[PDB]
Write a protein that binds this ligand. Structure first.
Ligand SMILES: C[C@]12CCC(=O)C=C1CC[C@H]1[C@@H]3CC[C@](O)(C(=O)CO)[C@@]3(C)C[C@H](O)[C@@]12F
Length: 244
Protein backbone atom coordinates (compact mmCIF):
# COMPACT_ATOMS: atom_id res chain seq x y z
CA UNK A 1 0.00 0.00 0.00
CA UNK A 2 2.00 2.99 1.23
CA UNK A 3 5.21 0.95 1.29
CA UNK A 4 6.76 2.51 -1.83
CA UNK A 5 6.09 6.06 -0.67
CA UNK A 6 7.19 5.36 2.91
CA UNK A 7 10.55 4.43 1.44
CA UNK A 8 10.85 7.42 -0.91
CA UNK A 9 9.96 9.83 1.88
CA UNK A 10 12.36 8.19 4.31
CA UNK A 11 15.32 8.30 1.96
CA UNK A 12 14.79 11.83 0.64
CA UNK A 13 18.06 13.68 1.21
CA UNK A 14 18.03 16.85 3.32
CA UNK A 15 19.42 20.34 2.74
CA UNK A 16 22.92 20.65 1.21
CA UNK A 17 24.86 23.93 1.34
CA UNK A 18 27.21 25.06 -1.44
CA UNK A 19 29.65 26.64 1.00
CA UNK A 20 29.44 29.82 -1.04
CA UNK A 21 31.03 32.99 0.36
CA UNK A 22 28.26 35.53 -0.19
CA UNK A 23 30.61 38.36 0.82
CA UNK A 24 32.31 37.82 -2.54
CA UNK A 25 31.44 39.94 -5.58
CA UNK A 26 29.13 37.99 -7.93
CA UNK A 27 31.57 36.90 -10.62
CA UNK A 28 31.48 34.17 -13.29
CA UNK A 29 34.39 32.15 -11.82
CA UNK A 30 33.21 32.37 -8.21
CA UNK A 31 29.60 31.42 -9.00
CA UNK A 32 30.33 28.40 -11.16
CA UNK A 33 33.03 27.42 -8.63
CA UNK A 34 30.39 27.32 -5.90
CA UNK A 35 27.93 25.49 -8.15
CA UNK A 36 30.48 22.80 -8.90
CA UNK A 37 31.20 22.40 -5.21
CA UNK A 38 27.47 22.20 -4.64
CA UNK A 39 27.23 19.60 -7.38
CA UNK A 40 29.92 17.42 -5.75
CA UNK A 41 28.21 17.55 -2.31
CA UNK A 42 24.84 16.78 -3.80
CA UNK A 43 26.29 13.91 -5.82
CA UNK A 44 27.43 12.24 -2.64
CA UNK A 45 23.85 12.33 -1.38
CA UNK A 46 22.40 11.24 -4.72
CA UNK A 47 24.52 8.08 -4.65
CA UNK A 48 23.34 7.06 -1.21
CA UNK A 49 19.73 7.88 -2.06
CA UNK A 50 19.79 5.88 -5.24
CA UNK A 51 21.36 2.80 -3.59
CA UNK A 52 18.49 2.82 -1.10
CA UNK A 53 15.72 3.01 -3.67
CA UNK A 54 13.54 -0.11 -3.92
CA UNK A 55 15.07 -2.63 -6.31
CA UNK A 56 18.04 -0.46 -7.39
CA UNK A 57 20.56 -3.02 -6.20
CA UNK A 58 18.90 -5.52 -8.53
CA UNK A 59 20.80 -3.67 -11.28
CA UNK A 60 24.26 -4.92 -12.17
CA UNK A 61 26.71 -2.91 -10.05
CA UNK A 62 28.19 -1.56 -13.31
CA UNK A 63 24.75 -0.28 -14.36
CA UNK A 64 24.18 1.18 -10.91
CA UNK A 65 27.06 3.62 -11.33
CA UNK A 66 26.27 4.44 -14.94
CA UNK A 67 22.63 5.38 -14.51
CA UNK A 68 23.58 7.60 -11.57
CA UNK A 69 26.33 9.21 -13.59
CA UNK A 70 24.12 9.80 -16.64
CA UNK A 71 21.01 11.02 -14.84
CA UNK A 72 22.42 13.20 -12.06
CA UNK A 73 22.10 16.49 -13.95
CA UNK A 74 18.40 15.97 -14.60
CA UNK A 75 17.79 14.73 -11.05
CA UNK A 76 19.51 17.78 -9.54
CA UNK A 77 17.79 20.27 -11.83
CA UNK A 78 14.42 18.74 -11.08
CA UNK A 79 15.09 18.72 -7.33
CA UNK A 80 16.34 22.30 -7.52
CA UNK A 81 13.14 23.39 -9.25
CA UNK A 82 11.14 21.80 -6.44
CA UNK A 83 13.27 23.58 -3.81
CA UNK A 84 12.80 26.83 -5.63
CA UNK A 85 9.03 26.29 -5.83
CA UNK A 86 8.57 25.35 -2.21
CA UNK A 87 10.93 27.96 -0.81
CA UNK A 88 10.69 31.11 -2.89
CA UNK A 89 7.68 30.26 -4.99
CA UNK A 90 10.03 29.74 -7.95
CA UNK A 91 10.74 33.47 -8.10
CA UNK A 92 14.46 32.81 -8.03
CA UNK A 93 16.69 29.76 -8.40
CA UNK A 94 17.26 28.22 -4.94
CA UNK A 95 20.39 26.11 -5.59
CA UNK A 96 21.15 26.05 -1.88
CA UNK A 97 20.29 28.01 1.30
CA UNK A 98 23.54 29.90 0.81
CA UNK A 99 23.48 30.14 -3.01
CA UNK A 100 20.25 31.71 -4.23
CA UNK A 101 20.35 33.21 -7.72
CA UNK A 102 18.71 36.60 -8.36
CA UNK A 103 18.64 38.21 -11.83
CA UNK A 104 22.08 39.71 -11.41
CA UNK A 105 23.61 36.31 -10.67
CA UNK A 106 21.79 34.79 -13.63
CA UNK A 107 23.49 37.32 -15.85
CA UNK A 108 26.95 37.18 -14.29
CA UNK A 109 26.90 33.39 -14.51
CA UNK A 110 26.60 33.76 -18.30
CA UNK A 111 23.79 31.20 -18.43
CA UNK A 112 20.83 33.52 -18.15
CA UNK A 113 18.68 31.78 -20.74
CA UNK A 114 19.28 28.37 -19.21
CA UNK A 115 18.29 29.83 -15.83
CA UNK A 116 15.07 31.11 -17.33
CA UNK A 117 14.26 27.63 -18.57
CA UNK A 118 15.10 26.32 -15.09
CA UNK A 119 12.77 28.86 -13.60
CA UNK A 120 10.03 27.88 -16.05
CA UNK A 121 10.48 24.23 -15.00
CA UNK A 122 10.27 25.39 -11.40
CA UNK A 123 7.07 27.30 -12.13
CA UNK A 124 5.43 24.11 -13.38
CA UNK A 125 5.36 22.61 -9.90
CA UNK A 126 3.11 25.55 -9.06
CA UNK A 127 1.03 25.52 -12.27
CA UNK A 128 0.28 21.80 -11.91
CA UNK A 129 -0.05 21.80 -8.15
CA UNK A 130 2.46 18.95 -8.04
CA UNK A 131 2.12 17.02 -4.78
CA UNK A 132 5.13 15.99 -2.66
CA UNK A 133 4.27 12.39 -3.41
CA UNK A 134 4.17 13.04 -7.16
CA UNK A 135 7.43 14.97 -6.89
CA UNK A 136 9.10 12.05 -5.10
CA UNK A 137 7.90 9.45 -7.60
CA UNK A 138 8.78 11.59 -10.60
CA UNK A 139 12.26 12.21 -9.22
CA UNK A 140 12.86 8.47 -8.74
CA UNK A 141 11.80 7.79 -12.34
CA UNK A 142 14.33 10.42 -13.56
CA UNK A 143 17.06 8.17 -12.27
CA UNK A 144 15.88 5.63 -14.86
CA UNK A 145 15.42 7.98 -17.78
CA UNK A 146 18.77 8.06 -19.58
CA UNK A 147 20.83 5.12 -20.90
CA UNK A 148 23.40 4.03 -23.52
CA UNK A 149 21.95 3.50 -26.98
CA UNK A 150 23.70 0.14 -27.03
CA UNK A 151 21.99 -0.76 -23.74
CA UNK A 152 23.35 -1.48 -20.24
CA UNK A 153 25.20 -4.49 -18.85
CA UNK A 154 21.92 -6.02 -17.71
CA UNK A 155 19.28 -4.18 -19.69
CA UNK A 156 16.36 -6.47 -18.92
CA UNK A 157 16.78 -5.74 -15.20
CA UNK A 158 16.65 -1.99 -15.91
CA UNK A 159 13.53 -2.31 -18.05
CA UNK A 160 11.52 -4.05 -15.30
CA UNK A 161 12.67 -1.57 -12.73
CA UNK A 162 11.75 1.36 -14.95
CA UNK A 163 8.50 -0.36 -15.71
CA UNK A 164 7.73 -0.72 -12.03
CA UNK A 165 8.56 2.91 -11.22
CA UNK A 166 6.18 4.07 -13.95
CA UNK A 167 3.56 1.85 -12.35
CA UNK A 168 4.21 3.39 -8.92
CA UNK A 169 3.58 6.80 -10.54
CA UNK A 170 0.29 5.79 -12.10
CA UNK A 171 -0.58 4.40 -8.66
CA UNK A 172 0.23 7.61 -6.81
CA UNK A 173 -1.95 9.40 -9.28
CA UNK A 174 -4.74 6.82 -9.07
CA UNK A 175 -4.66 7.16 -5.29
CA UNK A 176 -5.40 10.90 -5.34
CA UNK A 177 -8.34 13.00 -4.08
CA UNK A 178 -8.87 12.47 -14.82
CA UNK A 179 -5.96 10.22 -14.00
CA UNK A 180 -5.52 10.00 -17.75
CA UNK A 181 -5.05 13.74 -17.93
CA UNK A 182 -2.74 13.83 -14.91
CA UNK A 183 -0.49 11.10 -16.21
CA UNK A 184 -0.15 12.89 -19.55
CA UNK A 185 0.77 16.08 -17.70
CA UNK A 186 3.40 14.55 -15.43
CA UNK A 187 5.00 12.68 -18.33
CA UNK A 188 5.24 15.90 -20.33
CA UNK A 189 6.86 17.56 -17.30
CA UNK A 190 9.34 14.71 -16.92
CA UNK A 191 10.21 14.87 -20.62
CA UNK A 192 10.82 18.60 -20.27
CA UNK A 193 13.65 17.96 -17.84
CA UNK A 194 15.83 16.38 -20.48
CA UNK A 195 16.35 19.27 -22.94
CA UNK A 196 17.29 21.44 -19.96
CA UNK A 197 19.72 18.80 -18.67
CA UNK A 198 21.21 18.61 -22.16
CA UNK A 199 21.83 22.38 -22.19
CA UNK A 200 23.56 22.26 -18.81
CA UNK A 201 25.64 19.27 -19.88
CA UNK A 202 26.88 21.22 -22.88
CA UNK A 203 27.54 24.23 -20.72
CA UNK A 204 29.49 22.30 -18.13
CA UNK A 205 31.50 20.52 -20.82
CA UNK A 206 32.48 23.75 -22.51
CA UNK A 207 33.35 25.27 -19.12
CA UNK A 208 35.53 22.33 -18.16
CA UNK A 209 37.47 22.55 -21.45
CA UNK A 210 38.27 26.22 -20.85
CA UNK A 211 38.36 25.80 -17.06
CA UNK A 212 42.03 26.74 -16.73
CA UNK A 213 41.31 30.01 -18.57
CA UNK A 214 38.03 31.17 -17.01
CA UNK A 215 39.36 30.25 -13.55
CA UNK A 216 36.53 27.84 -12.69
CA UNK A 217 37.33 24.91 -10.41
CA UNK A 218 36.06 21.35 -10.87
CA UNK A 219 36.11 18.97 -7.90
CA UNK A 220 37.31 15.49 -8.67
CA UNK A 221 34.17 13.54 -9.22
CA UNK A 222 32.87 16.32 -11.48
CA UNK A 223 35.91 16.78 -13.71
CA UNK A 224 35.76 13.03 -14.16
CA UNK A 225 32.05 12.77 -14.78
CA UNK A 226 32.07 15.72 -17.13
CA UNK A 227 35.01 14.47 -19.20
CA UNK A 228 34.19 10.75 -19.15
CA UNK A 229 30.42 10.47 -18.90
CA UNK A 230 29.04 13.72 -20.23
CA UNK A 231 30.70 13.51 -23.67
CA UNK A 232 28.92 10.17 -24.17
CA UNK A 233 25.64 11.98 -23.81
CA UNK A 234 26.74 14.93 -25.96
CA UNK A 235 28.05 12.59 -28.63
CA UNK A 236 24.75 10.70 -28.67
CA UNK A 237 26.04 7.40 -27.27
CA UNK A 238 23.79 7.90 -24.25
CA UNK A 239 20.26 9.20 -24.76
CA UNK A 240 17.28 10.13 -22.60
CA UNK A 241 14.21 7.96 -22.56
CA UNK A 242 11.27 10.18 -23.61
CA UNK A 243 7.61 9.34 -23.05
CA UNK A 244 6.31 11.38 -26.02
C1 LIG B 1 23.93 20.21 -10.98
C2 LIG B 1 23.91 21.66 -10.44
C3 LIG B 1 24.36 21.66 -8.95
C4 LIG B 1 23.31 21.31 -7.91
C5 LIG B 1 22.02 22.03 -8.15
O1 LIG B 1 21.27 22.33 -7.22
C6 LIG B 1 21.67 22.38 -9.55
C7 LIG B 1 22.49 22.21 -10.58
C8 LIG B 1 22.04 22.56 -11.97
C9 LIG B 1 23.02 23.55 -12.63
C10 LIG B 1 24.44 22.99 -12.64
C11 LIG B 1 25.46 23.96 -13.19
C12 LIG B 1 25.16 24.53 -14.59
C13 LIG B 1 26.55 24.96 -15.09
C14 LIG B 1 27.58 24.58 -13.99
O2 LIG B 1 27.77 25.61 -13.02
C15 LIG B 1 28.97 24.24 -14.56
O3 LIG B 1 29.09 23.66 -15.60
C16 LIG B 1 30.17 24.68 -13.77
O4 LIG B 1 31.36 24.65 -14.56
C17 LIG B 1 26.89 23.39 -13.29
C18 LIG B 1 26.94 22.11 -14.15
C19 LIG B 1 27.36 23.06 -11.86
C20 LIG B 1 26.37 22.16 -11.07
O5 LIG B 1 26.50 20.81 -11.42
C21 LIG B 1 24.89 22.56 -11.22
F1 LIG B 1 24.88 23.84 -10.54
Amino acid sequence: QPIFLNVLEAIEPGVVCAGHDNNQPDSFAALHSSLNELGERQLVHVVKWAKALPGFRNLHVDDQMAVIQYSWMGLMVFAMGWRSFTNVNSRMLYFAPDLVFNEYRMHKSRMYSQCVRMRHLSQEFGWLQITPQEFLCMKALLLFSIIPVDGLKNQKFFDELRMNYIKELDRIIACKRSCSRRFYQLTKLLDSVQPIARELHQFAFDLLIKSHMVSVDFPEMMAEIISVQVPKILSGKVKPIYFH
